């Protein structure tokens, strides 16, 4: 009912975190981020993840994903996940460790494998993305056939992700 | 100049409603919704409509649509209309009863027929959508030729809309 | 470290401007605009530019553009630039005089020539757009080959831009 905010987390005074949200050590939350586990709960945000301005994390009352701890979540965000300007993560949703979600991109009703890079103005809905895939800018990924055909992340893509954060 | 808020409406303390806005019985407005009839006015929001976080309703000084009461509006939102996360309704705009507007979708200078379902990351501009049409995720509908060719809403699409709200 | 706000600028009480931002005479900034030169700085916003609700101006710590004064900026916005609802300008970025950026459009790591019209739901990234080009609604411009092939702005496009502001 109250968020658990790790003492080593850095949450902006003007960020809004409500309900059963667990924020791990080293997570950075910018001003004008909204995390509300008032419908769908609980939410996990793993160590050293980064949420930038305009990011929103919400969830449906019904629908859960399996966390790495074998517990059920509305939203599971792994370690070192980057959720950039204006991104929307809407439960049920799973982002594995080292994922990047680019500006104005949406993840809804989906599981995103570790080390994936989702670029700008993209939608990922109703699918499982395998680990280490690249979603190009402007992509509209709404079927498992599209998700299974995504190309692999290259070193240059991770380098890009690190520069943006 | 002052909004009319029906006593049976449920408006969040942190929602911002300004100018000649009429909010009917049973309308739910989330925190971080902005409705400003400070340029284009008036706005009607019909019974049991739902506005989710990030939604914005604004309007141009000039340009109106015919409401169901035969009066002129910058924005007419019918009954049981769902305006979901980050949607932008910009007058002149008409949404008929039982319309759904999905995450990050925009309706501008357009009339949307009753019982239409507009999915995620879509734009509807400068057109009339006939009653009961479906606008797929990522669609960019900017001509009357595109609007006239949209497919019909299926029962599964309305079921989807009800689950999201 | 403190913004310079020209006494002839009109900034909403609820707009958030932070760090080394220079706002020129006649600039209008709406409520719920965010301009933060807390990572990338400095930002210039030229005379009689307009920023509408939901607009965000931010910048990367590293990466600059050449301003018209031959000084380096994270973000250079020229004179009479229109940055409309939910647009994201992310440094390093240059917008020349008389540019229009339509609803929910993004300019990142790019130079946009004077008198260009970028329409709704568009992305402009990693490119130089020549002066006086048109970017259609929904366009995803991520390569210099795409930017070099854009059509010219017509009089009707500027007329459209003036009507929106
Ligand atoms: Cl958006
Ligand atoms: Ni929600
Ligand atoms: Ni407006
Ligand atoms: Ni930024």
Write down the residue that tokens 């959720």 correspond to. Answer: A83
Nearest Cβ partner for C88 among A104, A137, A163: A104
How large is the greatest C-alpha to C-alpha distance in chain C, in angstroms? 43
Cβ-nearest to C123 among A54, A85, A121: A121
DSSP one-letter code for B75: E
Overall number of domains in chain B: 1
Using a CB-CB cut-off of 8 Å, the residues of chain A touching C104 are 104
Identify the CA nearest to A118 among candidates A97, A103, A96: A103
Q: How was this structure determined?
A: X-ray
> Positive or negative CA dihedral for B155, B157, B160, B162?
negative
Resolution reached, in Å? 1.7
Picking from A111, C123, C129, the residue whose alpha carbon sits closest to that of residue B138 is: C123
Which residue range forms the structural domain that includes residue A21? 1-165
Closest CA to C42 of C17, C15, C12, C9: C17
Q: Which residue of A has its CA nearest to B52?
A: A58
Q: How many angstroms does the Cα of residue B110 sit away from the middle of ligand 3?
A: 15
Helix (H) or strand (E) holding A82: strand A82-83
The string of DSSP codes covering C64-97 is -EE-TTS-EESEEE-TT-EE-TT-EEEEEEEE-T
Helices (H), B23-154: 144-148
CA distance linking residue B71 with residue C113, whole number of Å: 44
- Tell me the CA distances in angstroms from A2 to A20, A42, A59, B55, C3, one per residue in order: 6, 11, 16, 26, 37
Q: Is the peptide bond before C42 cis (omega within 30 degrees of 0)?
A: yes
Subunits that touch chain A (at least 3 Cβ pairs < 8 angstroms)? B, C
**How far does the CA of residue C140 sit from the closest CA of chain A (Å)?**
6
Catalytic residue list contains B39: yes
Contacts of A58 in chain B (CB under 8 A): 53, 85
Indicate which of C14, C17, C34 best probes the interface with A, i.e. most A CBs within 10 Å of its own CB.
C34
Q: Are B11 and B5 in contact (CB under 8 A)?
A: yes
Which residue of A lies nearest to B32 if distances are taken between CA atoms? A34
Question: Are the C-beta atoms of C138 and C155 separated by less than 8 Å?
Answer: no
End-to-end CA distance of chain A: 31
Alpha carbon separation from A68 to A25, A147, C134 (Å, rounded): 17, 22, 47
Alpha-carbon distance values, C1 to A14, A21, C15, C17, C19 (Å): 20, 34, 17, 11, 5
CB A92 within 8 A of CB A74: yes
Half-sphere exposure of residue A77: CA atoms within 13 angstroms, side-chain side: 33
Which residues have C-beta within 8 Å of that of residue A149, sequence separation ≥ 6? none
Rg (CA), chain C: 14
CA of B9 to the centre of ligand 1 (A): 27
CA angle B53, B7, A62 (to 5 degrees): 40
**Structural contact between residues C91 and C40, judged by C-beta atoms closer than 8 angstroms:** yes
Q: Are strands C75-77 and C43-45 parallel, antiparallel or unpaired?
A: parallel
A138 and C123 within 8 Å at the Cβ level: the answer is yes
A121, A122, A159, best to mutate vs chain C, most C CBs in 10 Å: A121
Q: Which chains touch C (3 or more CB pairs under 8 A)?
A: A, B
Suggest the residue from B33, B58, B87, B143 to mutate for an interface test with chain C (most C CBs closer than 10 A).
Answer: B58
**Alpha-carbon dihedral of residues B111, B117, B122, B125, nearest 10 degrees?**
-10
**DSSP result, chain C:** ---EE-TT-EE-TT-EEEESEEE-TT-EE-TT-EEEESSS--EEE-TT-EE-TT-EEEE-SS--EE-TTS-EESEEE-TT-EE-TT-EEEEEEEE-TT-EE-TT-EEEEEEE-TT-EE-TT-EEES-EEPTTBEE-TT-EE-SHHHHHTPPBPPHHHHHHHHHH-
CB C91 within 8 A of CB A85: no
């Amino acid at each position: 009912a109250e968020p658990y905010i790790d003492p080593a987390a850095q949450v902006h005074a003007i960020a809004s975190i409500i309900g059963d949200v667990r924020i791990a050590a080293g997570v950075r939350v910018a001003a004008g981020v909204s995390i509300r586990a008032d419908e769908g709960a609980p939410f996990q945000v793993g160590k050293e993840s980064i949420l930038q301005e305009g990011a929103v994390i919400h969830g449906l009352e019904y629908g859960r994903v399996l966390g790495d701890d074998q517990a059920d979540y509305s939203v599971w965000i792994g370690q070192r996940v980057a959720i950039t300007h204006k991104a929307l993560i809407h439960g049920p949703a799973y982002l594995g460790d080292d994922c990047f979600v680019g500006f104005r991109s949406t993840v809804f009703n989906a599981r995103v494998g570790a080390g994936s890079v989702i670029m700008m103005h993209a939608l990922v809905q109703d699918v499982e993305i395998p680990p280490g895939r690249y979603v190009p800018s402007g992509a509209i990924i709404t079927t498992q056939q599209q998700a299974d055909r995504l190309p692999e992340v290259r070193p240059e893509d991770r380098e890009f992700a690190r520069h943006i954060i």
